[PDB]
C-alpha cells in the first residue's frame, strides 16, 4: 500500500505534462516532416541547365548550386542587391536545436527539485494519515457529550477543550511549515522553469521574424558555378538560374510553429499565476478538521513561497490519494445544513 | 475486489466510444490513403513538356507547376478568368487538422471532468452496495411477520413502520443528491463537447462545399514558367498545359468524408438528447426497493441537472457490475405476480 | 472458478464464427491481392504511344488514360458505341466498402444482444449447478426407499412425492422462462443479422452480375489526350489506343468472390433454420431430471422465441461447462437397461 | 494436475500431425518460391520487340503477351496447331486453391469429432485412475492370503472370488463401451478425413498429369499483338515471337510437389490401416488387471467401431499420462517369471 | 522437484547436439550466401550482346542464356564436344534437399526412440534414488558394528550379513535390466542414425565429385539463341559468348562443405564407437554401492545392447542430477586411502 502510494505520486501536474509534450513534439514532428519531403522529393532543388548538359553535369550543378547557400547568398528577380537563402538549408538543424532548447528546461526542473518535493510530499501525507485518524477518533466522545448535553454552549466549550488537550496538533508539521514558509528553492526553480519556456518561446518568434519573413516566399534564385576555377570554362553558362521545390512545405512549418507556440504563450503564464494566489471553497472545506487546520492558517504572508508548491502538490495528489472524498462530503452537508454533524458521525461508522 | 471495480469503471460510456474513435480514424486513414498515392506515383503531377527538353528539365517543369499551386492560379480550358487549385495540396494538411479538431473535444472531457465523475460513481456504488445489503437484511423479519399475519393492512402498517425505523435512508445520500441537482459542471461538459462535434462537423462541411466543388473535377491546368526570372528564354515555352493524375483519389477522398461524417450527425444529436429525458421501466422496476428508492423520487426537477450525467452514467456501469441482476428479476415476479418476496429472499441467500 | 466460467462463456457460436471470418476476411484478401499487383508491375495500364514521345510524355499518356476512367467511358473494338471500364478502377475501394457492410451486422449483434444474453445465461447457469446439486441430493433417499420396497407403485408414488416436496422446482426459473417466451429481442437481432449477411450478399451479386459481366474481358481500350485543351497539338495523336495489364487478377478476383459468398448462402440458411425447430434425444435426455424438467416443458410454444436463442447458447455451452458429462451417460445406461439410479449415484458421489 | 492433464491430451495421433503439416506447408512453400521467382527477375517473361521500338512500347509488348496466356493459346516451333500456356500464370492460385482443399478436411475433423473424442476420453481416464486404485489396494489382502496358503488351488479360489465381489467391473463402463461399440461417428469421420486426402491427392496427381505434360518444356512461344484493334499499324510487327524466363521454376515446382504428395501415398494408407487390425502385446499385458480387464473382452466384435478409436487416442495418451508406466514393468515381470505381485505391490506402495 | 527434474532430463546428449546442429547449419548458410549473391549483383550472368542490341534485346538474351543451362549443354574454349553447367543453377535448391536430408534422420530418431528412453530413465533413476537412501540409512548400523569390534573378519562377516538382508538388491531392477540386456531397439536406432549420417555425408562427396570437379572452373561458356523459332533473323549473332559472374561463390561453397563434412566424419565414427565398449573409473567407483552395483555386473554381455544406450544416458544425467555429487568423492577417498565411510557418512548427514 505504502509503496504504490509513492509510485503514484504525481510530481509534475497533469496541465504541464500536455504543455511539455506539445512544446517537444511539435518541432520533432516538423523536423521529420522536412526530412519525410527531403527524401520523398529527391533533390532538394531543382536547376534548369542547358540542354548540351549531360545528366551528370546537370546533377553537379544541381549539388553545386544547393550546396551553395550556407557560404554565399542567391538574389531572385525581385529582390535588393543581395538576399540570403540559408534558412532553408539548416531548417531540421534549428528545429532539433529548439526541441533540446525546449526540453532543457524540464530535465532542470526534474534534477533540482523532484527529490525534495518527493521526501516532503511523502512525509506530509504519511503525517496526515494518521493525523486525521487521531482527529476522527475523538468525533465519537464529542459525539456523546452533544447527546448529554444540547445546549451549544457545552458544545463550544468542549470543542475549545479538545482543541486544548494536546493530543494532536502535531508540533512537528507545525515546525516544519514554519521553516518551510521561508524557503524559496521550489519557487525559485518554477519559476526560473516557466521563465525560462517563456523566453525561448520568445527566441523562436525572434528567429522566424528575422530569418523567414525576408525569404518566405522567395521563388527562384540566380545561382553560379563559375566562382571557383571553372572560370574559362565557356562550355558552361555564367548564371544558371533554379527553383527549391520543397518551399510550400517550409513556408508551412513556419507558420505551423509560430502559431503552436502562440496557444502556449497563455497558458504557461497561466502556470506561473498559480502560485502568486493561495489555493477558497476548499479552504473553508479544510479549515474545520485539526489535521488540515494547522496548514490553512499559514497563508498570511505573501503568497510566493516554498509553502505554495507544496500546497499546489497536495492537492493535485490528495485529489486521488483518498484522504480527500470523505471531508468533502461532510462539508457539504455543512452547507446543506441549515445535525449534519451527526449524519457524518453516522455515515463514518457506518 | 475494490481496486480492481474502480479500475473497470466505465468513464466514457459505450456508444459515445464508436462515434468518438470514428471521428478520428477516418480522416487518419484518408491522410494515409493519401501519402500512399502520392508515393505510389512518385510524382503527384504530370506535365507534357515538349520534346526538345532533357529529363531535368522535363522534372524541373513538373516541380514548378506543382509547387505553384498555393501561391498562384492555374485555369482550365472550361473555367472563368481564375480558378484556384490550392485545395489539392493542402489535403493532408487539412486533414491533420480535422483529426486534431476532432480530437481536441474527447481531451477537453477527459482533463475537464473524469476526476469527479469517477470520484462520484465510486462513492455512490460504494454507498449503495451497503444500502441493499441493509435493506435485504429486514425481508427476513418481514417475511415471518408475514407469516404470523396474512391480512394486507398490517403489511402496509409494517412496510410504513420500516420506512420509518430510521435505520436506513442515509441521510448522506439525501444531502449528496440535493447538492447535486444544482451542479451544472457535467451537464456543462458534456453538451460542450457534443456542440463542439457539431460545430467541427459543419466547419468540415463548409469547407468541403467551399473550396472542393469549385475544382471538384478540374482535370488540366495551364502551368506557366516564364512568370520568373527565365522571361527571355526562347527554348522553353510559355504556357506548357499539364495534369494531375491523383485526381480520382481527391474527389473519392471529398465524398468519402462526407458521407461519414452525415452517419455522425444524428447519432450525436442523439447522445445529446439522452439528457432531456430522465431514464421509465427501470425507474419503476428499482423504485420499490428503499435504496434505489431515494435517488428515482428527483424525477420532478428539469431533466438538465448533473445528477441526469450521473444517472446514466450510473444505470452503464450497474449493467456490468452485479448489483442490478437481482432486482430485476424481483421486478418481473411483481410483475407477473397476480411469496414473491420470500422467493427473491431465498434466491439471494442461495 | 466463477469468474473464469463467465470468461469462457462462448456468446457467438463456434459455426458462426467461421461464416464471420471468411465473409470478412476474403473481400481483405482479394484487396491486398488487388494492392499487391498495382505495385508489382509499376503502373495499372500500358499505352502504346508513338515512337516521337520522350519518356515523360509517355508517362503523361500513361496517367491521363488510366485517370480518365471514372469521369468518362472508353470504348474497346468489339462493343457497342460505349462501354464503361470504371469497375477496373473502383475495386480495391468497392471491396474496403464490402468488408465493412459485411462486418457492421457483427457489430450490431455484439452491441444490441450481447449483455442480455451473457446475463441471462450467466443466472441461468448459476441456478442450474445448484440445482443440480439439490436434485441429486434426494437420490439417496431414493434409493434407500428402493432398497425397502422392490414394488414399482411405491416407486411411482414416492417420485410423485419427491416432485410434489416443493423442495425443489424453483418457481424463480418458472417465471423467468414464462417471461422470455414472450420476449422477442434475440430472436429479432438473430434474424435480422443473418437476414442483413443475405442481403449484402445478393447485393454484391447484383454489383459483380451488373458491373463485370460487360466489361469482365475488355483487353484493350482506345483512350484520347486531346479532349482536354491541347486540341491543336498536331504533335500528339488522335486516338492512342492502350491496353490494361492487370485484367487477368481482375477477372479472378470477381470469380472467386463469387464462388465464396455462394458457399456462404446455404450455411446462413442453416442457421436461420435452428430456430424453427427446437433442440431431440437430448431434450428427451434432460427431461428425467427436475432441474432440466421445468424448461424441457416449455417446447409447446412456437419456436420462434427468446427462449430458443437462450437454449441454443445453453447448449453449446453446457457441452462444455462440466454439468452435462454426466446425465448424458445415465439417460445412456437408461436406454441400455431393459438399479441404474444406484449406479449413477454411485459415479457422481465418487 | 486435472486442469493440466486435460490440456495435455492429445486428439491428433502423433504420426497425422507430421502428415497434416507437411501437406499444407510443402504448397504455401513451393507458392513463395514462386512469388519470390516473380519479383526476383522483375518480369515474368521477356521478349524480343525490335530494335525501333521504345523502351515503353517494348514493355506494352510484354505485357500484352504475358497477360494474354488466359485468354489465348499461343504456339511454339515445335508444337500442333494450338497449345495452351495458361497453367504458367495461375500457378500460384492452384497452389493457393490446392493449400485451402488439403486444409479442409482438417477442419472438418476438428469441428466434428473433437469434442466427443475430448469428453470421452476424459472421462475414461478420470474413471480409470480410480479403478486402478481400487483394483491395487486389494492386492494387499491377495498377498496375505497367499502367504497363509501356499497351494495354488486356494490362490485360484480367492481370485475368483475377488473377481465376483462386486467391488469393481464398474458396470458404468460396461454399459459404455457396450453403446460404443455401436456408435459410428468417429470411425465415419476419420476415414472421411482419409478418403479426403486420398482424393485430393488424386486430383493433384491429374492436374500435374493433364495440364503440365503437355507444356512441361515449351520453351518459346510466338505471340501477337495486331489482334486487338491496332491490326492497320504498320510500325509493329506481325507474330512478335518471345519466352519465358521462369521455366525451370515451373519444371521444379511441378516435379516436387509430386514426389512430396507420393511419400504421403503410403503413410495415410497406414493410418487407415490402423482401424482394421485392433491394438496385441499390450492387450495381454493389460488383460490381467481388472481395471483394464473390461475394456481387453471387446476385441471380438468387427475393428471397424468407435470404440478401435477410443482405444488408438486412449493408447496415445497412456504413453504420456502416467498410469502405464507401472503395469508394464509388471507384465515385464510375468513374461521373466519362470512373488510378482509382492514385489508390483512394493513398487507401487513405494 | 520430480516435474522439473523429468524436464531437465537431456534425451540427446552433449555432444551430437553440436553435429546436428552442424550439419542442417551449414548447407542453410550457404545456400543463403548463394540467394545473397544471386540478388546482390542483380542477375547471376552477363553476355557480351553485340551492340546494336538495345536493353530489353540484351536482358532478353541473358534470361535465354542463363535459362538454358537445365535443358541444353554449353561449351567453352577449353572444353571437349560437350560440357554441363547445369550445377551451377540448382545449387541452392541441392543445399535444400541436403539439408532436408541431414536432418531426416534427427527426425527418425526422436519419434522412434525418445518416448522408450524418457520412460526407462524416469523410472531408473526414480528407483535409484531410493535405492540410495536405503543404501545409505544401513551405513550407521555399520559403522557402530565396526567400532564395536575393530578386527576385518566380523566387518567382512556383517558385510556379507547386510548384502544377505535382502531389505534391498531390489529384484525389480534385476529383471528390468535382464530383460533390457536383450532388447536391441535403442541400440537398432542409434545404429541407424549415425549410418544415414555417414550415407549421407557420402552422398555429399560423390555429388560434388561427379558434378563439380567437372565445371569447376569454367569461366566462359557459347550460348545460342537460334535454336528457337526465331532462325531467320540474320540481326542476331548466331553463339554469343558470355559468362557467369557468381563461379567464385559456387566454388568456394562447394570447398567449404567439403571441408566441413570431412570434420564430421571422424566425430560421426566415434559416436558409433561409444557401444562397443561399456562405460573403467566410475564403473569401478559405482560397483561399491549395492544400489549402482546391480546394474554394474551386467558388463559380460555383448557390448552392443539396449542397456549399453541407457547407461550412456544415464551417466551423461547423472552428471548433472545430483545423485553422483557424493559416491565420487567417497571414491577418491578410498583412493586416498591407504574411517572412510564414517567421513562419507558424516558428510551425507551434513
Ligand atoms: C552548348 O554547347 C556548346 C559546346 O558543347 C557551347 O559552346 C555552348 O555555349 C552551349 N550552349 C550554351 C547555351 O551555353
Ligand atoms: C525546340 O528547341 C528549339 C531550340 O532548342 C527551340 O527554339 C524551340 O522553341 C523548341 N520547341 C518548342 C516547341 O519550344
Ligand atoms: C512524329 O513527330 C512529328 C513531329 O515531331 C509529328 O508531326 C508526327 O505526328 C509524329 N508521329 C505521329 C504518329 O503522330
Ligand atoms: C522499323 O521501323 C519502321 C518505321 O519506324 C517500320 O516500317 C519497320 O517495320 C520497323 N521494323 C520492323 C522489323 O518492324
Ligand atoms: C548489326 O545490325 C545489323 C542490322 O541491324 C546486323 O545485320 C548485324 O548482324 C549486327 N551486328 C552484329 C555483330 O550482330
Given at each position: 500500500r505504502r509503496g504504490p502510494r509513492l509510485k503514484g505520486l504525481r510530481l509534475e501536474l497533469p496541465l504541464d505534462r500536455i504543455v511539455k509534450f506539445v512544446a517537444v513534439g511539435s518541432p520533432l514532428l516538423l523536423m521529420s516532416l522536412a526530412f519525410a519531403q527531403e527524401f520523398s522529393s529527391g533533390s532538394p532543388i531543382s536547376c534548369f541547365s542547358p540542354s548540351n548538359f549531360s545528366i551528370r553535369q546537370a546533377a553537379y550543378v544541381d549539388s553545386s548550386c544547393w550546396d551553395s547557400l550556407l557560404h554565399h547568398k542567391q538574389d531572385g528577380p525581385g529582390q535588393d542587391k543581395m538576399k540570403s537563402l540559408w534558412p532553408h538549408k539548416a531548417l531540421?538543424?534549428?528545429?532539433?536545436?529548439?526541441?533540446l532548447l525546449m526540453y532543457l528546461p524540464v530535465l532542470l526542473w526534474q534534477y533540482a527539485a523532484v527529490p525534495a518535493l518527493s521526501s516532503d510530499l511523502l512525509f506530509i501525507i504519511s503525517e496526515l494519515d494518521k493525523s486525521y485518524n487521531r482527529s476522527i477518533r475523538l468525533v465519537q466522545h464529542m459525539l456523546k457529550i452533544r447527546q448529554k448535553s444540547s445546549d451549544p454552549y457545552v458544545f463550544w466549550n468542549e470543542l475549545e477543550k479538545a482543541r486544548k488537550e494536546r493530543y494532536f496538533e502535531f508540533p512537528l508539521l507545525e515546525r516544519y511549515l514554519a521553516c518551510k514558509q521561508r524557503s524559496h528553492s521550489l519557487v525559485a526553480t518554477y519559476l526560473l522553469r516557466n521563465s525560462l519556456l517563456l523566453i525561448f518561446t520568445s527566441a523562436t518568434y525572434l528567429y522566424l521574424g528575422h530569418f523567414h519573413?525576408?525569404?518566405?516566399?522567395?521563388?527562384?534564385?540566380?545561382?553560379?558555378?563559375?566562382?571557383?576555377?571553372?572560370?574559362?570554362?565557356?562550355?558552361?553558362?555564367?548564371?544558371?538560374?533554379?527553383?527549391?521545390?520543397?518551399?510550400?512545405?517550409?513556408?508551412?512549418?513556419?507558420?505551423?510553429?509560430?502559431?503552436?507556440?502562440?496557444?502556449?504563450?497563455?497558458?504557461?503564464?497561466?502556470?506561473?499565476?498559480?502560485?502568486?494566489?493561495?489555493?477558497?471553497?476548499?479552504?473553508?472545506?479544510?479549515?474545520?478538521?485539526?489535521?488540515?487546520?494547522?496548514?490553512?492558517?499559514?497563508?498570511?504572508?505573501?503568497?510566493?513561497?516554498?509553502?505554495?508548491?507544496?500546497?499546489?502538490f497536495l492537492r493535485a495528489n490528495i485529489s486521488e490519494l483518498i484522504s480527500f472524498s470523505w471531508l468533502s462530503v461532510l462539508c457539504v452537508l455543512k452547507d446543506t445544513t441549515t445535525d449534519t454533524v451527526v449524519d457524518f458521525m453516522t455515515l463514518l461508522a457506518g
Open positions: 531540421p538543424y534549428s528545429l532539433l536545436a529548439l526541441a519573413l525576408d525569404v518566405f516566399f522567395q521563388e527562384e534564385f540566380s545561382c553560379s558555378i563559375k566562382t571557383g576555377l571553372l572560370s574559362d570554362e565557356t562550355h558552361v553558362p555564367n548564371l544558371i538560374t533554379c527553383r527549391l521545390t520543397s518551399l510550400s512545405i517550409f513556408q508551412i512549418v513556419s507558420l505551423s510553429s509560430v502559431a503552436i507556440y502562440t496557444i502556449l504563450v497563455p497558458v504557461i503564464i497561466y502556470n506561473l499565476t498559480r502560485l502568486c494566489r493561495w489555493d477558497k471553497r476548499l479552504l473553508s472545506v479544510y479549515e474545520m478538521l485539526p489535521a488540515f487546520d494547522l496548514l490553512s492558517r499559514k497563508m498570511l504572508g505573501c503568497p510566493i513561497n516554498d509553502l505554495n508548491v507544496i500546497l499546489l
